[PDB]
Amino acid sequence: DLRLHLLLNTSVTCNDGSPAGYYLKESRGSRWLLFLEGGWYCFNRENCDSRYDTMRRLMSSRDWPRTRTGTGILSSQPEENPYWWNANMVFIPYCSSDVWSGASSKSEKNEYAFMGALIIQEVVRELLGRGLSGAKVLLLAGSSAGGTGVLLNVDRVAEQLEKLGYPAIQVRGLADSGWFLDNKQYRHTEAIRRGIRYWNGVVPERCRRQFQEGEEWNCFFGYKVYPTLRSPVFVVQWLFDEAQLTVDNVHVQEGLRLYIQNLGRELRHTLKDVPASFAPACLSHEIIIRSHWTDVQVKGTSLPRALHCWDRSLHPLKGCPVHLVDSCPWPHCNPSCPT
Numbered sequence: 045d046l047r048l049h050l051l052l053n054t055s056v057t058c059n060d061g062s063p064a065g066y067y068l069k070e071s072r073g074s075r076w077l078l079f080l081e082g083g084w085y086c087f088n089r090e091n092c093d094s095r096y097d098t099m100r101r102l103m104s105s106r107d108w109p110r111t112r113t114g115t116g117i118l119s120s121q122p123e124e125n126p127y128w129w130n131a132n133m134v135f136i137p138y139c140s141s142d143v144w145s146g147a148s149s150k151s152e153k154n155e156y157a158f159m160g161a162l163i164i165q166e167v168v169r170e171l172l173g174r175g176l177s178g179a180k181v182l183l184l185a186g187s188s189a190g191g192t193g194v195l196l197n198v199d200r201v202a203e204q205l206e207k208l209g210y211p212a213i214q215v216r217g218l219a220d221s222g223w224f225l226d227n228k229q230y231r232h233t234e235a236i237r238r239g240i241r242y243w244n245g246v247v248p249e250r251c252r253r254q255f256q257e258g259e260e261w262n263c264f265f266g267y268k269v270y271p272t273l274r275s276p277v278f279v280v281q282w283l284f285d286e287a288q289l290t291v292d293n294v295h296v297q298e299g300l301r302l303y304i305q306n307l308g309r310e311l312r313h314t315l316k317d318v319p320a321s322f323a324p325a326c327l328s329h330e331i332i333i334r335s336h337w338t339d340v341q342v343k344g345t346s347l348p349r350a351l352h353c354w355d356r357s358l359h360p361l362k363g364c365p366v367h368l369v370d371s372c373p374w375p376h377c378n379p380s381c382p383t
């Protein structure tokens with residue numbers, strides 16, 4: 045169980061103005077995993093109002109429970125988490141509906157607050173007083189919108205710790221199911237463009253400088269923002285991601301067969317030069333906090349093993365690979381895919 049702490053700076057809020065927060069389980073014998081929850085987003089007054097009605101835990105802390113059970117990479121049991129079972133564990137709930145990009149308070153012109161980028165900054169600052177000041181490695185991880193959130197925020201956390209005087213903490217990222225293609229749909233980007241303006245969204249500075257004003261939406265797509273990042277980032281992405289297919293209007297004859305095979309090939313291509321990555325040929329979505337995340341393998345290597353090999357590479361390795369991408373071209377051509 046991880047224990048809830050609401051932020052002491054009550055000006056850093058969820059969408060409805062309630063305080064944001066984090067769930068923490070300390071491990072005093074260890075020198076930190078900070079996980080960003082996902083859950084889509086909203087981009088105007090009308091669809092944010094709908095989300096407040098039936099997805100309110102993603103917009104408010106008013107009904108959060110006092111504890112959460114750590115699962116998958118957040119579990120403290122070696123049988124469930126061979127990778128980092130002894131680490132300090134943090135779960136940051138997603139209550140800003142902005143893909144963790146926003147920096148805008150609720151005001152007399154704004155019905156909702158969109159503060160995802162500032163929530164991450166404030167969690168880091170308050171954790172430094174609870175033990176993070178002594179850390180050797182801070183791994184910023186996340187699933188779905190939280191995985192895109194890692195890509196948008198990992199270099200800002202690194203800069204924050206450097207400016208605060210902690211140059212010895214190594215900041216790294218782990219992006220799960222947050223690597224999308226802005227491709228042609230099977231049946232018939234504007235929502236991101238509108239969302240960024242609604243949220244006052246912020247993107248990493250080197251990427252912003254490349255694409256310039258009005259084109260910041262580009263930095264939400266992994267294959268465009270990743271080359272601009274300085275922190276080490278491990279990318280986990282199913283080749284046939286269910287959220288990607290939903291946006292593509294896919295739910296089998298020749299036209300759809302070719303569409304699906306082309307999607308897998310394009311995703312494989314975007315990862316060819318990503319040295320730390322794990323990309324199985326499965327139809328699924330998210331994995332790192334699922335309890336059975338230890339089951340899937342690529343070329344004989346599990347995801348917990350690949351992450352352990354990544355740790356060793358940051359001190360190629362014999363029998364300990366870090367770049368693992370399936371080549372077979374159809375969902376479940378990998379026998380270890382989730383049923």
Ligand SMILES: Oc1c(C[NH+]2CCOCC2)ccc2ccccc12
Nearest residue numbers: 192224225226227233264265288291
């Ligand atoms: O915008 C898209 C997404 C989701 N976006 C959400 C926010 O961050 C980045 C990805 C997924 C598939 C898409 C396919 C084609 C065009 C746009 C797409």
Ligand SMILES: *[C@@H]1O[C@H](CO)[C@@H](O)[C@H](O)[C@H]1NC(C)=O
Nearest residue numbers: 053054055056162163165166
């Ligand atoms: C609380 O957070 C806001 C927004 O980031 C910031 O402007 C303010 O300085 C913070 N308060 C303190 C005491 O640091």
